[PDB]
Design a protein around this ligand. Structure first.
Ligand SMILES: [Zn+2]
Length: 140
C-alpha cells in the first residue's frame, strides 16, 4: 500500500483505490494503474520534474529502501498478477529488484522528489508507475 500526497491530490494505485477515492475522483487511468483523488488537507510531497533514471524505492515486503536504476517510462508487457491479467501497462519503468503485490504504493524518489509508485513485480523486476509527466499535480 501507499500514496503520494501533493497539494490537494492523493495519488494511489488504481487497483487499491477506496470508495472515498472514487467519490472524490480527479483522474484515473487503468492502463497506468493510477488514480488521483482530491483531499481536504494540503499534502507536502514534491513530484520530481526530471528524466532521472536512478533513485531509491521503498519495498515494504523487505522493510528496506533500495537504490535502483530504472528504465524510461514505456508501454511494457506485464505478466498476470493477483490484481491484473497479463497485459500492456503504459508509463511504466522497470528496475531489477524485489516487488510483491503488498509493495504497490511504495515511493520511488530521486533528488528532485517523487518519481512514481510501485505498481508491478515478479521475475526479479519491480515496475513503477511514473507520475513525472502529470504536471497538473503541481497546481490548482
Ligand atoms: Zn530526478
Amino acid at each position: 500500500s501507499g500514496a503520494i500526497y501533493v497539494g490537494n491530490y492523493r495519488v494511489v494505485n488504481r487497483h487499491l483505490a477506496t470508495h472515498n477515492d472514487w467519490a472524490n475522483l480527479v483522474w484515473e487511468d487503468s492502463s497506468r494503474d493510477l488514480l488521483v483523488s482530491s483531499t481536504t488537507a494540503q499534502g507536502c510531497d514534491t513530484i520530481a520534474r526530471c528524466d532521472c533514471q536512478t533513485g531509491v524505492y521503498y519495498c515494504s515486503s523487505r522493510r528496506k529502501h533500495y537504490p535502483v536504476s530504472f528504465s524510461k517510462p514505456s508501454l511494457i508487457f506485464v505478466e498476470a498478477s493477483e490484481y491484473y491479467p497479463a497485459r500492456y501497462q503504459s508509463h511504466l519503468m522497470l528496475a531489477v529488484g524485489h516487488s510483491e503485490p503488498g509493495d504497490c504504493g511504495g515511493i520511488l524518489r530521486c533528488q528532485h522528489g517523487v518519481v512514481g509508485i510501485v505498481s508491478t513485480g515478479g521475475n526479479g523486476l519491480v515496475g513503477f508507475a511514473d507520475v513525472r509527466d502529470l504536471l497538473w499535480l503541481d497546481e490548482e
